[PDB]
Write a protein that binds this ligand. Structure first.
Ligand SMILES: [Mg+2]
Ligand SMILES: [Mg+2]
Ligand SMILES: [Mg+2]
Ligand SMILES: [Mg+2]
Ligand SMILES: [Mg+2]
Ligand SMILES: [Mg+2]
Ligand SMILES: [Mg+2]
Ligand SMILES: [Mg+2]
Ligand SMILES: [Mg+2]
Ligand SMILES: [Mg+2]
Ligand SMILES: [Mg+2]
Ligand SMILES: [Mg+2]
Ligand SMILES: [Mg+2]
Ligand SMILES: [Mg+2]
Ligand SMILES: [Mg+2]
Ligand SMILES: [Mg+2]
Ligand SMILES: [Mg+2]
Ligand SMILES: [Mg+2]
Ligand SMILES: [Mg+2]
Ligand SMILES: [Mg+2]
Ligand SMILES: [Mg+2]
Ligand SMILES: [Mg+2]
Ligand SMILES: [Mg+2]
Ligand SMILES: [Mg+2]
Ligand SMILES: [Mg+2]
Ligand SMILES: [Mg+2]
Ligand SMILES: [Mg+2]
Ligand SMILES: [Mg+2]
Ligand SMILES: [Mg+2]
Ligand SMILES: [Mg+2]
Ligand SMILES: [Mg+2]
Ligand SMILES: [Mg+2]
Ligand SMILES: [Mg+2]
Ligand SMILES: [Mg+2]
Ligand SMILES: [Mg+2]
Ligand SMILES: [Mg+2]
Ligand SMILES: [Mg+2]
Ligand SMILES: [Mg+2]
Ligand SMILES: [Mg+2]
Ligand SMILES: [Mg+2]
Ligand SMILES: [Mg+2]
Ligand SMILES: [Mg+2]
Ligand SMILES: [Mg+2]
Ligand SMILES: [Mg+2]
Ligand SMILES: [Mg+2]
Ligand SMILES: [Mg+2]
Ligand SMILES: [Zn+2]
Lengths: 124, 208, 104, 138, 83, 99
RNA sequence: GACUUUUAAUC
RNA sequence: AAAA
RNA sequence: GGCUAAUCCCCCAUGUGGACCCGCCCCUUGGGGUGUGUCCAAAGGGCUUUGCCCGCUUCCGGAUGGGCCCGCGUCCCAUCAGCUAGUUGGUGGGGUAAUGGCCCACCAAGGCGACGACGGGUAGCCGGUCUGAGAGGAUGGCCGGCCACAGGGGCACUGAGACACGGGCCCCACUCCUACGGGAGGCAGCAGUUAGGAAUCUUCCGCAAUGGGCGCAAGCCUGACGGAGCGACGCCGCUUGGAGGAAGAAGCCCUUCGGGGUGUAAACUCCUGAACCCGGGACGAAACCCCCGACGAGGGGACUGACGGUACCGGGGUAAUAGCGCCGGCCAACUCCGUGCCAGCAGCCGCGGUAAUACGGAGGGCGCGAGCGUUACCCGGAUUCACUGGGCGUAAAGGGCGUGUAGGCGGCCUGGGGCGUCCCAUGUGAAAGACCACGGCUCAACCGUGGGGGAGCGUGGGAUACGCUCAGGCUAGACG
């Protein structure tokens, strides 16, 4: 662009677009389970991925992944969404935080416990 | 809580003799003797060429594991060095050397920096007269580091300052085994130190 | 110091008042090239003395009406519509850019 | 019509030296002449002289090159490696004496035009006056 | 009414005031008109009080009214000593 | 509750009424004078203009009018009165006006 | 269950 | 037919 | 309805002076002087009572604070292009401390816009903050300056000052009282409740210090403030030991009931002594006031701390929290067992289909450590909106071609101006912050003192090469 052109139009400042309309750009959003289906992966994977249709307090109704070995979520349990997609399931852009509200932690867990929210086991 | 755990193991991983015990790290047992290979189930196994990164990460870990400083403190002393005018490399070493714990060690009042550190936190050391219980305290030039009068009578300080008779002290320092005094003369020039560390790489570790 | 500006008269159509077009010139904050911007000021002419095309000095003054804070200091050079012209044409080009197409 | 002569001249020189011409003409102008004066003094060129062509005032610019070289491509090193217009119509570039550039840690020059006349950045700093930064040469 | 008073600049348990000329109505630590000294109640250095008698006198001459402590301190610095 | 400083309200009201009273008279006499003036009655026109003047200054004594407000008043009065007597009046008492 | 390296499909 |  | 005081209200007087009108001047917008005529003052109180204190009146000036005006700068959308009637200007009037369509009547037909008017979205602005080599980008919580608001809307009264958070009036919504006529309210003050939310504290102590209001003063008021409290929310300091010294109860240690190293690490010996106990125990506070001196300068004396019996000093004294993430590559750190495209992992590339350094466990290792990790958001890397610093034949990108308006750009020589440009001096750039030096708390964080730089803009003076402008000339561009 000639300088004159630059002086007439300038450069467009590129704006960013969120991957997590968890609204209020909060770090988390509380929600409620509407459904607790199972979903199959894409690209080159196979399994019965566990998901949840959460009714957001931010006025949204999104689906969220349920990390961990096994869960205990029913068609009415309160839950905290956290942001972070699941590469294998297009459309799933949030995870449920294990250990908060009606979502139990992950029993039998031993390592990445802070994640999965599981209290420190006693080494008596 | 500056580490607090197996130490002759760090000498091992660093593949170099680190004197993190003063005594014993001389008598056929620093472990770096007849077992100079890293610790753990794979310590002996064949080693693959490290990444320019690893080489830089170990060098820093070496230099820091010597003084006992935490990354938090280490990093900050480095940033202060960086900011100041004068070859960061050396200046950093100089600031590391000015730490009271280390100075108390250079003067022999204690045999290891760890012991040295404890001797400061327990009020057995003094500076220009008033006692200072801060390992991180920074000694300036002209400062006198004595021994807590009420502590000059401890079996630990006796042995040590006794073994000091005959021992020479670093050119930037000077001591009087008599009244158990010692004087910080100047910041040790890089040349005055014989550290098993190439601080140029340390600097690079923080460039990335 | 009361600001003093020079410009051309582009309108005597008012009573005791004239419009002075003042040219400003300067380096663009980021792109550097000297750019020329302009602005019309409604100066006070107590004796409907100044006419179109007259280059006049304008002096910062005591408010005389909403939108009118200047008085004609003096006349620099009488006559020279060439400037007034540029202005009028630029004004006429306007009837065009819209829902159709005027003149060129 | 030439849109920017100082640039045309600068370029003519850039071009002529790249093929190793010996002479090289360029329409004459007081200003163009003043710049040449500096080029000659700083020793980027073997000098220059006024001339006529088809009956018009030109400036023969005698070019200068290093010596023949070894290996393939025995072409002389260039005396004028770089030479670029800085200020241009459609973005004139001015500078304060405090804003005069140090072209290539000194191994190069910068010709600026001041109210005290045309002069290398060195000279400009001397008299302590900036102006329109004309070209750059190293 | 313009005054000469003490403004708080130290820190918790470490008070340090600035002897200052200001309008009677501004925050204690607001925008003052001029600094004319400073003071350390705990005298932690051989320089815990300093004043610009020349300036102090200026404001007093144009109507500035000092606080009680302001005066106390100004007096120490010999602002009214005519002797 | 009751912040005894309701008194300021009580006081304001009296003051209000007090101010209102003074200004009313000023206007009335002002017109008054402007009236006789717009009729040539020079003697009694100035007479009153003179009271108006007095009242105004007095009003500006306390804080009713007060200021240059008073001065505008007088000015605007000694203005019209004198200009309306530009009808052959010939300032008789020439009381206020310094012809 | 069988085939395939697993799986779909197929018997 | 899908994955490698 | 009746009585009454004053520093409450009014009248007459004196007029230093001041205000207004008209001139018998200088200045230059309404500044200053002058003269005639009008016009305008005051409050008393206390004593150590014939003096002194507090206060009153008019005027000139200082200081401080503030109103108003102007140049320049200040986000996104042109899928917003035309907008405007008090609207632009004029005369007269009103209004105000004051200029002004500020408001009004009358006349005029103007004013604004592509250099983006009008409309829509978003938003308090700044010192600064974070980031970046820089240019720049993002931001404006804490602290400091300015603005705005005080349940939503409108209005004015009183004042030097308000159109007034804890003043007034009306309308509206809501709460409360109600003998249903009618009334009381406004935490965006401190604290606290409740609701919303992923989420944000004590219905604390004190007026001792600093500051403020009133008072001659004693002193009263001060949820401003000075402190303590709760929360690893942040930053800094510190501890869980130091020096010696290589063995393994019912041990998860390759469990259809299939046993690798950790590591001087432990044990254990010797030493110091976090907690904790006893004793002492602070600066912050010397003024106001009283006495001498003249209520002055100066000197003398006394009263007074929430924090707190806290910091700090001395004495005694116990070996006494460790966790969290990661180990396929990017990226520092590897093996066994379980599982078998399942269960699960995953920042990107990808991993799991019976021998998985990638899943879950275990041993081992790496990283950091009273923290560690996750999610969100900003700058960076990203020369990936490219001014510095990018591109368009085939990668995304030349308009289907022309004509042409505005605009941008402009050959050679001389001269005037000096707008751009450059230079010198000078003013402005509050403080805090940032940088450097020194200093106070044992260090540091933190804080104190001092120092230095700075673009932009104003003023005065100067330069004239280039750009510009005016004037003249040229013929190499262009046209004939
Ligand atoms: Mg797969
Ligand atoms: Mg994992
Ligand atoms: Mg009262
Ligand atoms: Mg097959
Ligand atoms: Mg199968
Ligand atoms: Mg597959
Ligand atoms: Mg009655
Ligand atoms: Mg009287
Ligand atoms: Mg009175
Ligand atoms: Mg808003
Ligand atoms: Mg960059
Ligand atoms: Mg309101
Ligand atoms: Mg509210
Ligand atoms: Mg008042
Ligand atoms: Mg009033
Ligand atoms: Mg208001
Ligand atoms: Mg309130
Ligand atoms: Mg509250
Ligand atoms: Mg809730
Ligand atoms: Mg007080
Ligand atoms: Mg009270
Ligand atoms: Mg407070
Ligand atoms: Mg040990
Ligand atoms: Mg004291
Ligand atoms: Mg008191
Ligand atoms: Mg005294
Ligand atoms: Mg990995
Ligand atoms: Mg690796
Ligand atoms: Mg396996
Ligand atoms: Mg594994
Ligand atoms: Mg810490
Ligand atoms: Mg960029
Ligand atoms: Mg991008
Ligand atoms: Mg570019
Ligand atoms: Mg590109
Ligand atoms: Mg293409
Ligand atoms: Mg084409
Ligand atoms: Mg095309
Ligand atoms: Mg054109
Ligand atoms: Mg030209
Ligand atoms: Mg100029
Ligand atoms: Mg300056
Ligand atoms: Mg500053
Ligand atoms: Mg210090
Ligand atoms: Mg000249
Ligand atoms: Mg010509
Ligand atoms: Zn060792």
């Amino acid at each position: 662009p000639t300088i004159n052109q630059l002086v007439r139009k300038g450069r467009e400042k590129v704006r960013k677009k969120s991957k997590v309309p968890a609204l209020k750009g909060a770090p988390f959003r509380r929600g409620v389970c509407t459904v607790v289906r199972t979903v199959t992966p894409k690209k080159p994977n196979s399994a019965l991925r566990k998901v949840a249709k959460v009714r957001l307090t931010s006025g949204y109704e999104v689906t969220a992944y349920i990390p961990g070995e096994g869960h205990n979520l029913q068609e009415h349990s309160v839950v905290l969404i956290r942001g972070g997609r699941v590469k294998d399931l297009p459309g799933v852009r949030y995870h449920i935080v294990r250990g908060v509200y009606d979502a139990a932690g992950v029993k039998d867990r031993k390592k990445s416990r802070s994640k999965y929210g599981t209290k420190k086991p006693k080494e008596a | 809580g500056r580490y607090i755990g197996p130490v002759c193991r760090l000498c091992r991983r660093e593949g170099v003799k680190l004197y993190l015990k003063g005594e014993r790290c001389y008598s056929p047992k620093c472990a770096m003797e007849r077992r100079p290979y890293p610790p753990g189930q794979h310590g002996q196994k064949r080693a693959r060429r490290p990444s320019d990164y690893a080489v830089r990460l170990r060098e820093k870990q070496k230099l820091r594991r010597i003084y006992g400083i935490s990354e938090r403190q280490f990093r900050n002393l480095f940033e202060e060095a960086s900011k100041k005018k004068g070859v960061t490399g050396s200046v950093f070493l100089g600031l590391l050397e000015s730490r009271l714990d280390n100075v108390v060690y250079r003067l022999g009042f204690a045999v290891s920096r760890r012991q040295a550190r404890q001797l400061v936190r327990h009020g057995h050391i003094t500076v220009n007269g008033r006692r200072v219980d801060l390992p991180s305290y920074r000694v300036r030039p002209g400062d006198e580091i004595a021994v807590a009068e009420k502590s000059r009578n401890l079996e630990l300080i006796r042995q040590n300052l006794e073994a000091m008779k005959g021992r020479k002290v670093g050119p930037w320092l000077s001591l009087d085994v008599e009244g158990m005094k010692g004087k910080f003369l100047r910041l040790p020039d890089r040349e005055d130190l014989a550290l098993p560390v190439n601080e140029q790489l340390v600097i690079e570790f923080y460039s990335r | 110091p009361k600001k003093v500006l020079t410009g051309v008269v582009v309108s005597d159509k008012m009573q005791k008042t004239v419009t002075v077009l003042v040219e400003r010139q300067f380096p663009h904050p980021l792109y550097g090239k000297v750019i020329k911007r302009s602005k019309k000021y409604l100066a006070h002419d107590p004796e409907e003395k100044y006419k179109l095309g007259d280059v006049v000095e304008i002096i910062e003054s005591r408010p005389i009406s909403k939108r009118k804070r200047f008085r004609v200091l003096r006349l620099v050079e009488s006559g020279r519509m060439d400037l007034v012209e540029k202005y009028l044409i630029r004004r006429q080009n306007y009837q065009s850019l819209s829902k159709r197409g005027g003149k060129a | 019509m030439l849109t920017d002569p100082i640039a045309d001249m600068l370029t003519r020189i850039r071009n002529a030296t790249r093929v190793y011409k010996e002479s090289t003409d360029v329409p004459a102008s007081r200003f163009k002449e003043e710049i040449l004066r500096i080029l000659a003094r700083e020793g980027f060129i073997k000098g220059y002289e006024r001339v006529d062509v088809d009956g018009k005032p030109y400036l023969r610019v005698y070019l200068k090159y290093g010596p023949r070289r070894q290996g393939p491509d025995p072409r002389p090193e260039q005396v004028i490696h770089h030479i670029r217009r800085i200020s241009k119509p459609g973005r004139r570039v001015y500078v304060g004496v405090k804003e005069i550039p140090r072209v290539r840690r000194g191994l190069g020059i910068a010709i600026l035009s001041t109210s005290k006349g045309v002069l290398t950045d060195r000279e400009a700093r001397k008299l302590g006056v900036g102006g329109e930064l004309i070209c750059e040469v190293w | 009414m313009v005054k000469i008073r003490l403004a708080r600049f130290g820190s918790k348990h470490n008070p340090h005031y600035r002897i200052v000329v200001t309008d009677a109505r501004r925050k204690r630590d607001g925008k003052y008109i001029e600094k004319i000294g400073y003071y350390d109640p705990r005298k932690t250095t051989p320089d815990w009080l300093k004043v610009d008698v020349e300036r102090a006198r200026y404001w007093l001459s144009v109507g500035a009214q000092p606080t009680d402590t302001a005066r106390r301190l100004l007096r120490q610095a010999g602002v009214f000593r005519q002797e | 509750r009751n912040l005894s400083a309701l008194k300021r309200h009580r006081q304001s009201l009296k003051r209000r009424l007090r101010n209102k009273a003074k200004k009313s008279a000023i206007k009335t006499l002002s017109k008054k004078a402007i009236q006789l003036a717009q009729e040539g009655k020079a003697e009694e026109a100035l007479k009153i203009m003179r009271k108006a003047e007095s009242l105004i200054d007095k009003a500006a004594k306390g804080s009713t009018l007060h200021k240059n407000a008073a001065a505008r008043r007088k000015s605007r009065l000694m203005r019209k009165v004198r200009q309306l007597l530009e009808a052959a009046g010939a300032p008789l008492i020439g009381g206020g006006l310094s012809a």
